[PDB]
């Protein structure tokens, strides 16, 4: 009967909670007393990419740590030479409602999508001289919330239908479809090893999906409200999440539970995006309250503030070289900081 | 600089094209076509002559409407309604064949912090079957609180008051309209509300507000 297997579900959940507690012999918040802070961060806008005219929603660095892609409500996906501020390309989007950017690891491809359910992929290096649509990855039922390239041929998508997917860009079919959120998925992050990727949904449950075997290897449920940001720690074993709970938390895939809560009493503002510095010491999260904060992941204190926006700091990325963080905003000016 | 002067030149051409596209996109007026399922959202745009958003657009005497139907795709509304902040008006519509989930939807939209200062046009659609409904059944079944007669005018005014009373802020206006699928009148009222709205926003830009 349904009651019997529901009782078994309750027993299993209790047992795994008990084992998860059994793994909680300590927590980083109490170990970190042995180490000093990085001191105050006071990064300032070394550039401003003032080309956009309506609410940059997402941005993503290229692998060379100098080019960008930025998707905005304007309907333009204009990609930057960060050093000279040049608009090296400006792709006219199919839809202005794009919530997602992806800049391929080779730099050849860019993909973008949003409320249109489609992860459109743009080929930059055409012999014809202009950026053009490589693939319309249609097949999700909800809106898209994040995209990340594993390689130039296969991309992973997170969507509002409570499913992620991994595609074959050469044929446009999902080589794996990932399901098992109860809410809807807001963010996504490939591991550095490209073997496993985490996602977070509005049901406050974040989980790691292995890309080959689509099984969720661990479900994380520490949050009180919707997960809104996802990013892996640079070592590929830990990940951090931001939520409309006005707080972030750090999770570990081998301890399968939460370690830190990134909350201060005065920040009643939701989290729009997260990312890490190259060393993982610094966790950078963009808040609704017109600013980003940068916080020692090992200590959870606000190491500094990168205010300077007229609206929500809607997106955020850090260079692979670790020498710059971009903070897109609904002000449409992409600050570049160092 | 080296020949990268040519890179800066092409950057300038791209930036000028972005500005020329911006000052050609802001001419169009943005409308969000919220509403409950089968309320008549498609009908109004069809008389104007799909798994995700659909953004149908049209012109009406020197004004171009971008008229987004965000309701075709289902997910937590708090995650995609907030995109349409800075839309000029919500074209909220209601069907009376029901239903309180529509009342609840209005109580959400008209109170929403992203639409606090955003006007709303409320089309009470398919009045014809609303008259048939009250003619064949008492309105009390839909509103147990109702004490008025089942005559059309009183019931319609009652439900209209029910909807517009959910407004929590005085600054906005709710241009409720009983369209009854009248051809081209719904478009006219949309235009008139939008003309009021853009006079308001022009006047508010000038520092008169």
């Amino acid at each position: 009967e349904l009651d019997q297997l529901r009782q078994e579900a309750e027993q299993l959940k209790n047992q795994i909670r008990d084992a998860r507690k059994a793994c909680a012999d300590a927590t980083l918040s109490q170990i970190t007393n042995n180490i000093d802070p990085v001191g105050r961060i006071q990064m300032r806008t070394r550039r401003t990419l003032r080309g956009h005219l309506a609410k940059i929603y997402a941005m993503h660095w290229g692998t060379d740590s100098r080019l960008l892609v930025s998707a905005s409500q304007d309907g333009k996906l204009i990609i930057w030479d960060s050093y000279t501020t040049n608009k090296v390309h400006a792709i006219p989007l199919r839809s202005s409602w794009v919530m997602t950017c992806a800049y391929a690891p080779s730099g050849n491809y860019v993909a973008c999508g949003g409320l249109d359910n489609i992860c459109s992929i743009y080929n930059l290096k055409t012999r014809e001289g202009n950026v053009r649509v490589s693939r319309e990855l249609a097949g999700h039922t909800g809106y898209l919330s994040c995209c990340r390239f594993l390689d130039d041929n296969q991309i992973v998508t997170s969507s509002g239908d409570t499913t992620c997917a991994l595609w074959d860009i050469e044929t446009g079919q999902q080589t794996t479809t990932f399901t098992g959120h109860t809410g809807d998925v807001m963010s996504l992050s490939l591991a550095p090893d490209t073997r496993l990727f985490v996602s977070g949904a509005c049901d406050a449950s974040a989980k790691l999906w292995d890309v080959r075997e689509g099984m969720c290897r661990q479900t994380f449920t520490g949050h009180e409200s919707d997960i809104n940001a996802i990013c892996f720690f640079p070592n590929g074993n830990a990940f951090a999440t931001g939520s409309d709970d006005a707080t972030c938390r750090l999770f570990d895939l081998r301890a399968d539970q939460e370690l830190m809560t990134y909350s201060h009493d005065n920040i009643i503002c939701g989290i729009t995006s997260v990312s890490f510095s190259k060393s993982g010491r610094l966790l950078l999260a963009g808040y609704d309250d017109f600013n980003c904060n940068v916080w020692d992941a090992l200590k959870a204190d606000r190491a500094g503030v990168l205010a300077g926006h007229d609206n929500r700091v809607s997106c955020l990325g850090v260079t692979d070289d670790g020498m710059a963080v971009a903070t897109g905003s609904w002000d449409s000016f992409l600050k570049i900081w160092n | 600089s080296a020949e990268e002067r040519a890179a800066l030149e092409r950057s300038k051409a791209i930036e000028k094209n972005l500005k020329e596209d911006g000052i050609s996109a802001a001419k169009d007026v943005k409308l969000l076509l919220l509403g409950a399922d089968n309320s008549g959202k498609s009908t109004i745009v069809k008389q104007m002559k799909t798994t995700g958003i659909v953004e149908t657009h049209f012109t009406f005497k020197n004004l171009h409407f971008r008229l987004f139907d965000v309701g075709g795709q289902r997910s937590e509304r708090k995650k995609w309604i907030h995109c349409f902040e800075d839309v000029t008006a919500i074209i909220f519509c209601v069907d009376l064949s029901d239903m309180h989930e529509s009342l609840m939807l209005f109580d959400s939209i008209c109170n929403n912090k992203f639409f606090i200062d955003t006007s709303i046009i409320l089309f009470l659609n398919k009045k014809d079957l609303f008259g048939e409904k009250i003619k064949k059944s008492p309105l009390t079944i839909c509103f147990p609180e109702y004490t008025g007669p089942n005559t059309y005018e009183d019931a319609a005014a009652y439900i209209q008051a029910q909807f517009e009373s959910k407004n929590r802020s005085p600054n906005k206006e709710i241009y409720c309209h009983m369209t009854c699928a009248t051809d081209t009148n719904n478009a006219q009222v949309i235009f008139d509300a939008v003309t009021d709205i853009i006079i308001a926003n022009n006047l508010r830009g000038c520092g008169l507000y």
Partner: single-chain antibody, 232 residues
């Protein structure tokens, strides 16, 4: 299928004028600069003209300034060279070329077919090559060199040199741009390197298809070297 094709050659009386035309297809013309580079019938390449993207900027060769004028009409995907008061030095095969300038782009990535302009009898960056010919054998490795009057390494870190290969009766081709970067189609057999003013290109496992003249070029300031002819 990119096409750079030119027409308007033939005989012209000295002191006259002739308009060479470049009629491109297969790519977004508007995005590109164009140069109407020319080659003497038995000698090296020479720069002539430069029409920028959207016709926003233009330069000419000192040996043709004022005499030769270039014009671009983007809606027809065409570039023009109007030459006036022709001298004997203007006799040459004229190659239309292609370029795009932005981070990581490859200028001169395509070259035209060539038009034979002929007339009867009537503070600069020079490039030089230590060899005019080298005998080579298939499967061996050939190491070309050229040297230019000034260091091409700009402040921004780029060394603005390009390497071209010309086979008999064939349009010239780009191999390497900015001295390290392979063109989108040049086989990985070829590879460039250099520093200061000394500049080289290496081709390992030379096939017969690699025989020809290896003209190098500068691009720091708006010319071609003399080129070495590999012998089969």
């Amino acid at each position: 299928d990119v096409q750079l094709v030119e027409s308007g050659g033939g005989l012209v009386q000295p002191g006259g004028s002739r308009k060479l035309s470049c009629s491109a297809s297969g790519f977004a013309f508007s995005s590109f600069g164009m140069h109407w580079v020319r080659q003497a019938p038995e000698k090296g390449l020479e720069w002539v003209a430069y029409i920028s993207s959207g016709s926003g900027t233009i330069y000419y060769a000192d040996t043709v300034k004022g005499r030769f004028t270039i014009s671009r009409d983007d809606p027809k995907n065409t570039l023009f060279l109007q030459m006036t008061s022709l001298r004997s030095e203007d006799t040459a095969m004229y190659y239309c070329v292609r370029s795009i300038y932005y981070y990581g782009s490859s200028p001169f990535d395509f070259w035209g077919q060539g038009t034979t302009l002929t007339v009867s009898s009537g503070s600069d960056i020079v490039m030089t090559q230590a060899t005019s010919s080298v005998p080579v054998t298939p499967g061996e490795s050939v190491s070309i060199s050229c040297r230019s009057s000034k260091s091409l390494l700009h402040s921004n870190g780029n060394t603005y040199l390009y390497w071209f290969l010309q086979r008999p009766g064939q349009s010239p081709q780009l191999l390497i741009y900015r001295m390290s970067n392979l063109a989108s189609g040049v086989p990985d057999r070829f590879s460039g390197s250099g520093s200061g003013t000394a500049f080289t290109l290496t081709i390992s496992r030379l096939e017969a298809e690699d025989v020809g003249v290896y003209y190098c070029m500068q691009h720091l300031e708006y010319t071609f070297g003399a080129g070495t002819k590999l012998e089969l």
